[PDB]
């Protein structure tokens, strides 16, 4: 998939809308999902 | 907003601020540029009911405060995350679900760019069409070998073509006005033209009166709700019939003169 | 002329519902006549309309 | 002085993610044609943060929310992209 | 072009020689009113009292008098 | 709506019913509105579809209006277009992209939250300080240390950016704050766009150079006005092209008859009209016989592309093919050589000479000439390296 | 025409409902003119469990036959597992799986390395 | 593949009108059933 | 192809002004109609009983 | 409704004979109306695949592309009089 500019705008709106245990078992992919999603909507 | 999908929307476009060949052409070019923008804002494809928005928004926003079944929930969650990945990444073997675009769908459609593109107002030609049509009619003519190829022939085929064209146009008009909603539309337009003609008449005859030798009940409810056979004088029917019969009175003699000529 | 000077949607719809009300379900005059009518003053608020209506429901 | 790129702009999302957000370990050998110490520390900090967000020990008692010490390392590159896009007007003739 | 325009002008001059109604008999198959020719009468649905006022105003405008 | 109560509506029994039933009155009103709109729909559909019966195309050009050039396929062709010049493609697209970045609200909510942050500098909801403490030394080498230092200078570099340029909404670089929001209405956003000169970038905005109204000066009516007029003509021509594409997508004749281009001439019979309306309906649009059969088109093209000689070239004395003149590790191993290519030779050579330009962190604007992109970046790096020896 | 809120949503909802109703009537008819044999356990296992990825192994062990998981606790654990898988696939999309970047993009996005046919046909088949 | 009549009939402005008319029709059908009191 | 679009328009508007707005079924519909109060309230203004 | 699970291998041949449902090429010689002039075999095939796989996007995307064709016109990369030539295109 390659988004057009309008679909990129839809992605930015969805990502900026959405949201509104021991360290061992924590997955190795434990990053900030919202920050990575928005840094993917850009670039 | 209320007159959006109608021909009476290109008359509000000329009532905006300045927005700035003739000045009317410049204003029309400015309105086309204003329609070109707000499509370049890339907000037209956004819909609040898109499956893409329901993937993020209505999935974190619904939980709120508030094989078998388990491996039917796991696969559903995996499919939802697969669609989210396809909408964001270079994920493979996932097909996206589209949405109906409802904002600024075709900005180039509700514009009249014809008078600007054909270089009018600054300062192509038809009629090869009918010449080619009658030329093909003559050149082929279907041959009336059943009347042993008569001499006239092309005259008969041209008469058939003209009769068929006239009858097709008239049949289309009659079939269009045979719809009761089309008759409602005609009645509404006739009422509007009567009131506007009264305004014209008021102004004009008042001027040519002082220039000599120099509420809904009355206002479109008892007309819109009544059968128009009632509120229409027989005078206008007789007038239209007299005009029609005066116009089409020389048709037999002109037909005889055309067909009996060379 | 005959096609354009024909009843529109409003006049056609007021011709079938009007028939249904004042022409088809106005046959209840024979019912209310065999049970009881006064007519004439059965207009206004005689209060026998309510009794006739509930008697028509009860049958 | 004119419009040009820079290596300091860090236009690559792979750079911006292997340096700031994604810290994993790959075990393979190359076939066709990075301060591990720091990476392990950042991964452990990431794990502690995820854990804390999972036991709802933050003021916002939600597992996933919107932080607002917004990342300068992301807002700066968004502004850089906008500036380089709007400064192309001086690239005429 | 002059021949085509002359044919149209000959048709128009024939209509001018027709002029008015004189010389033509009344026809029982073609009365002067289409409501006579067809069978078009107003009935119970559509006719209302105010329609007389509107009819008066339309007839005044059709006759050509500025009174109502 | 309270109406149908006077004497003026006395006589109709259904109106007499609707006197005492407001729900019937409202049903009548809504039904009459819906019936009128249905009549509008019927009439508009007829007015859309019935002109399609009256369209006839030229039989010589098949409705195109342009024919292949008699010579050369020149002084008989058209006069090319603005976009055929391949040397100016990247400059034209760069200026267009710079213009479109003004309108682009793809990063709209992000710039809105940045605007709110710089408006009210009293925010909250931090809840965890980022640790993010490793700019280790000005020493050592590699790529990790350089990228990590450039990533750790983000706060001071962002302060420099906000001091030199500020927010785009505070300098009108973007469209501004919430002016065009979807889901509001098509028409409120049109009003907001028509407000001031929001449909134009500040490079063409009239309310930026009116202060130079005395004596003209920097040609606010001769350069800025010319640029704005050219931009408006380009967007109007884009709308015309989109209308032509929309008409071509449904097999209809194109409404806008464009002038012939550098490979085409006007049609002999039309002159460029290519189609027109007429009183006589089209019997190809009717009865569906508008498009030719595929086998018939194949037979026509095969016979046209395969001429045959019915005379043996020994009785007629012909020894050569038809034409004039008559008597008479490359292109067979590798195959030809590109012709449109050649202006990018210097950039290709420089990209091969300096492999560091292939860095993923580097993003040049793009271009082929000495001015723009790779050569501009290399000249900037060389000027910096020369001037750091003197400082 | 349809329920009020928007016609832009109820029209795809009606198309989806028609497609899924046609699927549910195509099924339950091919379970009456062709009722299920042990295929109901063969094609619903194995080929479905293979599509189930990692990070669901913990919840599959816990909720199914190893413990209990209530209703909202089960949904919360399923959401957590789905988000772990989502983050893993985002990482696999940008920096790759457990392999280098020169295979994450260079041979994968650029479609070099043609699919294994000689080895997968001789050594395997 | 260019369904011009259906694209014209299901244009966004016409869809907005159909939504408004469905709202009015549903409200005036409810008002007429809930009046049974 | 020329006649179906008129039927489509007519049906599409019939769904909104007849199916939803104003229905009209046959048979026994006494208990659903308050209209009959007005209907018997104008009986002396209707045709002489016969 | 019924439970008579008849077994026959000619039903595959009958289902293959229901390719006339897909193409509607039998309609003129059977009824007089050439429905193949208006039927969309690709849309029928997409609907059949969507029904079989329980994936309604396969049919819905094609139907929406057919309806909203104008919005599928190229609006990215075609900005402001993007005509080259016939000769440059050649
Ligand atoms: Zn031509
Ligand atoms: Zn030439």
**Token pair for F28:** 């009548």
C-beta of residue C56 within 8 angstroms of C-beta of residue I30: yes
Cα of F56 vs centre of ligand 1, distance in Å, is 11
Polymer length of chain I: 50
Residue G82 C-alpha, separation from nearest chain B C-alpha, in angstroms: 6
* Residue B14 contacts F, CB cutoff 8 Å: no
Measured between beta carbons, which residues in chain C are less than 8 angstroms from residue E34? 1-2, 5
Cα of F267 vs centre of ligand 1, distance in Å, is 5
**Torsion over CA: G8, G10, G14, G17 (sign):** positive
Q: Is B48 exposed, middle or buried (0-12, 13-18, 19+ CB in 10 A)?
A: middle
The 3-state secondary structure of E9-67 reads HHHHHHHHHHCCCCCCCCCCCCCCCHHHHCCCCCCCCCCCCHHHHHHHHHHHHHHCCCC
B99 pairs with which residues across the strands?
none
* Surface of J (42-61) touching B: CB under 8 A: 55-58, 60-61
Interface chains of chain A (3 or more CB pairs under 8 Å): B, D, F, G
In order, the DSSP letters of G84-107 are: HHHHHHHHHHHT-SSS-HHHHTTT
Binding site residue list of F for Zn(2+)? 58, 61, 69, 72, 74, 77, 267, 270
Q: Which residues are CB-contacts of F8 (< 8 A; sequence separation ≥ 6)?
A: B217, B218, B221, B222, E48, E49, E50, E53
Q: How was this structure determined?
A: cryo-EM
Q: Is B135 exposed, middle or buried (0-12, 13-18, 19+ CB in 10 A)?
A: exposed
The closest CB to that of F105, out of A9, A38, A42, belongs to A9
Nearest C-alpha in A relative to D69: A35
Residues F184-188: contacts with CB under 8 Å, at least 24 apart: F185/B1, F186/B1, F186/B4, F186/B103, F186/B104, F186/H12, F187/B1, F187/B4
Q: Which residues are CB-contacts of B113 (< 8 A; sequence separation ≥ 6)?
A: B32, F236, F239, F240, F243, F256
Q: Which residues are CB-contacts of J1 (< 8 A; sequence separation ≥ 6)?
A: none
Please name the helix (run of DSSP H) or strand (run of DSSP E) that holds residue F264, with its range, or none. strand F264-266
- Are F8 and B176 an interchain contact pair (Cβ–Cβ within 8 Å)? no
Measured between beta carbons, which residues in chain I are less than 8 angstroms from residue H29? 20-23
Interface chains of chain B (3 or more CB pairs under 8 Å): A, C, E, F, G, H, I, J
Q: Which residues are CB-contacts of E8 (< 8 A; sequence separation ≥ 6)?
A: none
Residue F103 C-beta-side C-alpha neighbours within 13 Å:
23
DSSP state of I3: S
Best of I13, I14, I40, I42 to substitute, by most chain C Cβ atoms within 10 angstroms, is I40
Distance CA G20, CA B99 (A): 18
Q: Which residues are CB-contacts of J86 (< 8 A; sequence separation ≥ 6)?
A: F66, F68, F261, F262, F263, F264
Helix axes D72-86, F89-103, angle to 10 degrees: 130
Please name the helix (run of DSSP H) or strand (run of DSSP E) that holds residue F255, with its range, or none. none
CA torsion D43-D47-D48-D54 (nearest 10°) is 160
Q: What is the Rg, in whole angstroms, of the alpha carbon atoms belonging to chain H?
A: 15
Q: What is the Rg, in whole angstroms, of the alpha carbon atoms belonging to chain C?
A: 17
Polymer length of chain H: 37
Q: Render the burial of F216-248: b for 16+ CB within 10 Å, e for the rest.
A: eeeebeeebeeebeebbbbbbbbbbbbbbebee
Residue G115 C-alpha, separation from nearest chain A C-alpha, in angstroms: 21
Distance CA J2, CA G25 (A): 14
**Token pair for F341:** 């290519």
Measured between beta carbons, which residues in chain E are less than 8 angstroms from residue F10? 48-49
Cα of F23 vs centre of ligand 2, distance in Å, is 74
Distance CA F264, CA F73 (A): 9
* Surface of A (22-41) touching G: CB under 8 A: 27, 29-31, 33, 36-37, 40
Distance CA G32, CA G25 (A): 11
Best of F70, F78, F84, F231 to substitute, by most chain J Cβ atoms within 10 angstroms, is F84
The closest CB to that of A20, out of B61, B87, B96, belongs to B61
SS3 G5: coil
Q: Which residue has the tokens 């990129």?
A: A8
Q: Is J83 exposed, middle or buried (0-12, 13-18, 19+ CB in 10 A)?
A: middle
Cα of G51 vs centre of ligand 1, distance in Å, is 60
Distance CA F316, CA F15 (A): 97
- Are E38 and C15 an interchain contact pair (Cβ–Cβ within 8 Å)? no
Closest C-alpha to F42, from A37, B4, H9 = H9
Distance CA F363, CA B141 (A): 71
Measured between beta carbons, which residues in chain I are less than 8 angstroms from residue F34? 13, 16-17, 21
Please give the C-alpha separations between residue F300 and each of D13, F340, I47, in angstroms, as whole numbers.
Answer: 56, 34, 78
Cα of F272 vs centre of ligand 1, distance in Å, is 7
Residue list, CB under 5 A from ion ligand 2: F 69, 71-72, 74, 77
Nearest C-alpha in G relative to B56: G83
Interface chains of chain I (3 or more CB pairs under 8 Å): B, C, F, G, H
Nearest C-alpha in D relative to F365: D4
Count of CB atoms situated within 10 Å of the CB of B161:
17
**Torsion over CA: B38, B40, B42, B44 (sign):** positive
Please give the C-alpha separations between residue G37 and each of F167, G25, G41, in angstroms, as whole numbers.
Answer: 68, 19, 8
**Token pair for D30:** 């190359």
Count of CB atoms situated within 10 Å of the CB of D91:
20
Cα of F265 vs centre of ligand 2, distance in Å, is 8
Polymer length of chain J: 90
Binding site residue list of F? 58, 61, 69, 72, 74, 77, 267, 270
SS3 F26: helix
The closest CB to that of H23, out of G4, G8, G11, belongs to G4
F261 pairs with which residues across the strands?
none
Q: Is G57 exposed, middle or buried (0-12, 13-18, 19+ CB in 10 A)?
A: exposed
Distance CA B160, CA B217 (A): 52
SS3 G51: coil
Please name the helix (run of DSSP H) or strand (run of DSSP E) that holds residue F56, with its range, or none. strand F55-57
Resolution in A: 3.2
Q: What is the Rg, in whole angstroms, of the alpha carbon atoms belonging to chain E?
A: 20
Q: Is J25 exposed, middle or buried (0-12, 13-18, 19+ CB in 10 A)?
A: middle
Distance CA J33, CA J19 (A): 18
* Residue F291 contacts H, CB cutoff 8 Å: no
Using left for φ > 0, alpha for ψ between -120 and 50, and beta otherwise, residue F271 falls in: left
Please give the C-alpha separations between residue F298 and each of C27, F294, I7, in angstroms, as whole numbers.
Answer: 74, 6, 39
**Torsion over CA: I10, I13, I17, I18 (sign):** positive
Distance CA F145, CA F138 (A): 9
Largest CA distance in chain C: 52
Distance CA G86, CA G84 (A): 5
- Are G16 and J60 an interchain contact pair (Cβ–Cβ within 8 Å)? yes
Distance CA E45, CA C7 (A): 10
Count of CB atoms situated within 10 Å of the CB of F376:
20
* Surface of F (157-176) touching H: CB under 8 A: none
Distance CA F297, CA F201 (A): 50
Best of B223, B226, B228, B234 to substitute, by most chain C Cβ atoms within 10 angstroms, is B228
Distance CA F237, CA F240 (A): 5
- Are H32 and F249 an interchain contact pair (Cβ–Cβ within 8 Å)? no
Residue B132 C-alpha, separation from nearest chain I C-alpha, in angstroms: 26
**Token pair for J74:** 């190229």
The 3-state secondary structure of chain B reads CCCCCCCCCCCCHHHCCCCCCCHHHHHHHHHHHHHHCCCCCCCCCCCCCCHHHHHHHHHHHHHCCCCCCHHHHHHHHHHHHHHHHHCCCCCCCCCCCCCCCCCCCCCCCCCCCHHHHCCCCCCCCCCHHHHHHHHHHHHHCCCCHHHCCCCCCHHHHHHHHHHHHHHHHHHHHHHHHCCHHHHHHHHHHHHHHHHHHHHHHHHHHHHHHHCCCCCCCCCCCCCCCCCCCCCCCHHHHHHHHHHHHHHCCCHHHHHHHHHCCC
Please give the C-alpha separations between residue A3 and each of B86, B96, F11, G49, in angstroms, as whole numbers.
Answer: 10, 11, 65, 32
- Are A43 and D66 an interchain contact pair (Cβ–Cβ within 8 Å)? no
- Are D20 and F173 an interchain contact pair (Cβ–Cβ within 8 Å)? no
Cα of F66 vs centre of ligand 1, distance in Å, is 7
Distance CA C58, CA J40 (A): 58
* Residue H9 contacts G, CB cutoff 8 Å: no
Count of CB atoms situated within 10 Å of the CB of G63:
17
**Token pair for I26:** 């046959």
Task: Give Cα B190 to chain centroid, integer Å.
Answer: 19
Chains E and H lie in contact, requiring 3 or more CB pairs less than 8 Å apart: no
Residue B85 C-alpha, separation from nearest chain A C-alpha, in angstroms: 10
Closest C-alpha to B45, from F376, F106, F312 = F106
Closest C-alpha to H14, from B8, B5, G10 = B5
Measured between beta carbons, which residues in chain I are less than 8 angstroms from residue F41? 9, 13
Distance CA C52, CA C49 (A): 5
C-beta of residue F238 within 8 angstroms of C-beta of residue F19: no
Distance CA F31, CA B62 (A): 39
Residue B83 C-alpha, separation from nearest chain I C-alpha, in angstroms: 34
Q: Which residues are CB-contacts of F121 (< 8 A; sequence separation ≥ 6)?
A: none
The closest CB to that of D32, out of G95, G98, G107, belongs to G107
């Amino acid at each position: 998939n390659r988004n057009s500019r309008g679909q990129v705008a839809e992605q930015v709106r969805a990502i900026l809308d959405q949201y509104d245990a021991k360290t061992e078992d924590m997955v190795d992919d434990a990053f900030t999902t919202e920050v990575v999603e928005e840094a993917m909507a850009l670039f | 907003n209320n007159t959006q999908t109608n021909a009476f929307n290109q008359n509000l476009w000329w009532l905006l601020p300045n927005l700035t060949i003739p000045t009317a052409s410049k204003n029309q070019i400015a309105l086309i540029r204003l329609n070109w923008a707000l499509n370049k804002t890339n907000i037209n494809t956004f819909t609040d009911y898109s499956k893409r928005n329901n993937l993020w928004t209505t999935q974190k926003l619904r939980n709120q405060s508030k094989l078998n079944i388990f491996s039917k929930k796991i696969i559903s969650k995996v499919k939802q995350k697969k669609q989210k990945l396809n909408y964001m990444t270079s994920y493979l073997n996932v097909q996206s679900e589209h949405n109906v675009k409802i904002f600024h769908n075709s900005w180039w459609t509700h514009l009249n760019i014809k008078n600007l593109v054909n270089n009018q107002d600054m300062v192509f030609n038809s009629e090869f069409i009918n010449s080619a049509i009658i030329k093909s009619i003559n050149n082929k003519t279907l041959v009336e070998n059943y009347v042993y190829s008569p001499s006239s022939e092309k005259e008969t085929m041209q008469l058939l073509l003209m009769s068929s064209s006239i009858l097709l146009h008239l049949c289309a008009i009659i079939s269009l006005v045979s719809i009761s909603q089309v008759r409602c539309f005609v009645k509404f337009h006739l009422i509007l033209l009567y009131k506007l003609s009264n305004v014209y008449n008021a102004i004009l005859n008042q001027l040519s009166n002082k220039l000599q030798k120099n509420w809904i009940a009355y206002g479109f409810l008892v007309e819109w709700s009544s059968d128009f056979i009632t509120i229409i004088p027989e005078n206008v029917d007789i007038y239209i019939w007299n005009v029609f019969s005066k116009i089409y009175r020389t048709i037999p003699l002109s037909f005889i003169s055309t067909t009996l000529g060379p | 002329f005959s096609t354009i000077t024909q009843p529109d949607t409003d006049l056609i719809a007021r011709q079938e519902k009007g028939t249904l009300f004042w022409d088809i379900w106005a046959d209840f005059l024979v019912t209310a006549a065999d049970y009881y009518n006064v007519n004439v003053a059965a207009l206004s608020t005689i209060k026998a309309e309510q009794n006739s209506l509930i008697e028509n429901i009860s049958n | 002085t004119s419009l040009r790129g820079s290596k300091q702009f860090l236009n690559s999302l792979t750079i911006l993610f292997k340096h700031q957000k994604m810290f994993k370990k790959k075990t393979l050998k190359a076939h066709k044609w990075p301060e591990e110490s720091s990476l392990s520390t950042r991964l452990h900090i990431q794990k502690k943060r995820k854990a804390k967000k999972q036991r709802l020990e933050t003021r916002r008692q939600k597992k996933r929310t919107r932080f607002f010490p917004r990342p300068v390392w992301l807002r700066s590159r968004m502004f850089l992209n906008f500036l380089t896009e709007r400064n192309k007007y001086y690239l005429n003739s | 072009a002059a021949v085509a325009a002359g044919w149209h002008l000959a048709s128009f001059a024939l209509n001018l020689a027709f002029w008015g109604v004189e010389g033509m008999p009344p026809d029982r198959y073609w009365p002067t009113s289409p409501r006579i020719r067809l069978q078009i009468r107003p009935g119970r649905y559509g006719n209302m009292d105010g329609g007389q006022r509107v009819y008066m105003d339309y007839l005044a405008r059709s006759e050509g008098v500025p009174l109502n | 709506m309270g109406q149908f109560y006077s004497r003026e509506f006395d006589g109709d029994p259904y109106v007499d019913l609707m006197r005492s039933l407001p729900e019937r009155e409202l049903v009548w009103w809504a039904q009459k509105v819906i019936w009128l709109a249905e009549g509008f729909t019927f009439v508009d559909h007829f007015a859309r579809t019935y002109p399609r019966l009256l369209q006839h195309k030229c039989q010589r050009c098949k409705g195109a209006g342009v024919m292949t050039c008699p010579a050369c396929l020149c002084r008989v062709c058209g006069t090319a277009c603005a976009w055929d010049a391949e040397s100016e493609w990247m400059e034209r697209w760069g200026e267009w992209e710079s213009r479109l970045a003004y309108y682009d609200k793809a990063t709209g909510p992000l710039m809105d939250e940045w605007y709110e942050d710089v408006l009210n500098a009293g925010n909250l909801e931090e809840d965890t300080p980022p640790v993010e403490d490793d700019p280790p030394g000005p020493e050592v080498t590699g790529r990790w240390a350089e990228h990590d230092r450039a990533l750790h200078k983000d706060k001071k570099r962002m302060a420099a950016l906000m001091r030199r340029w500020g927010h785009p909404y505070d300098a009108d670089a973007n469209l501004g704050y919430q002016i065009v929001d979807p889901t509001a209405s098509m028409g409120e956003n049109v009003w907001n766009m028509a407000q001031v000169y929001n449909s134009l970038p500040p490079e063409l905005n009239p309310l930026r150079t009116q202060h130079l109204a005395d004596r003209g000066g920097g040609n606010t009516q001769a350069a800025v006005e010319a640029a704005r007029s050219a931009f408006d003509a380009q967007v109007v021509m884009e709308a015309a092209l989109l209308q032509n594409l929309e008409a071509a997508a449904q097999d209809l004749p194109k409404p806008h008859r464009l002038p012939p281009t550098a490979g085409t001439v006007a049609c002999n019979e039309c002159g460029g009209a290519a189609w027109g309306y007429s009183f006589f309906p089209n019997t190809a649009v009717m009865f569906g016989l508008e498009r030719p059969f595929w086998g018939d088109t194949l037979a026509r093209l095969s016979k046209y592309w395969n001429p045959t000689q019915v005379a043996d070239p020994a009785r007629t004395g012909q020894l050569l093919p038809y034409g004039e003149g008559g008597l008479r590790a490359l292109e067979a191993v590798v195959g030809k050589a590109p012709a449109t290519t050649g202006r990018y030779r210097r950039d290709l050579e420089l990209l091969l000479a300096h492999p560091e330009l292939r860095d993923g962190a580097l993003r040049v604007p793009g271009g082929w000439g000495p001015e723009g992109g790779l050569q501009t970046y290399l000249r900037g790096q060389q000027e910096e390296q020369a001037r750091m020896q003197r400082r | 025409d349809l329920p009020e809120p928007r016609l832009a949503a109820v029209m795809p909802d009606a198309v989806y409902a028609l497609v899924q109703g046609t699927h549910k009537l195509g099924e339950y008819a091919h379970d009456l003119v062709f009722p299920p044999t042990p295929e109901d356990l063969r094609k619903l296992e194995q080929q479905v469990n293979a599509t189930i990825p990692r990070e669901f192994d913990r919840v599959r062990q816990r909720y199914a036959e190893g413990k209990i998981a209530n209703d909202e606790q089960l949904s919360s654990e399923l959401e957590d597992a789905s988000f772990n898988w989502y983050r893993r696939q985002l990482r696999t999309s940008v920096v790759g799986a457990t392999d280098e970047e020169l295979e994450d993009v260079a041979v994968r996005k650029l479609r070099l390395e043609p699919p294994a046919l000689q080895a997968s046909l001789q050594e395997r088949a | 593949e260019s369904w011009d009549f259906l694209g014209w009939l299901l244009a966004p402005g016409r869809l907005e009108f159909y939504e408004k008319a469905a709202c009015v029709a549903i409200a005036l059908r409810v008002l007429g059933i809930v009046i049974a009191i | 192809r020329y006649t179906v679009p008129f039927m489509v328009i007519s049906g599409l508007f019939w769904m909104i002004h007849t199916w939803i707005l104003d229905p009209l079924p046959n048979k026994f519909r006494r208990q659903e109609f308050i209209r009959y109060r007005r209907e018997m309230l104008h009986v002396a203004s209707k045709l002489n009983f016969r | 409704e019924v439970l008579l699970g008849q077994q026959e291998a000619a039903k595959n041949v009958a289902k293959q004979l229901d390719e006339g449902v897909t193409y509607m090429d039998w309609t003129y010689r059977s009824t007089g109306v050439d429905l193949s002039a208006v039927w969309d075999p690709e849309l029928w095939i997409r609907f059949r695949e969507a029904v079989a796989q329980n994936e309604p996007a396969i049919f819905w995307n094609k139907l929406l592309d057919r309806v909203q064709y104008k919005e599928n016109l190229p609006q990215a990369g075609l900005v402001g009089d993007m005509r080259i030539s016939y000769a440059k295109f050649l």
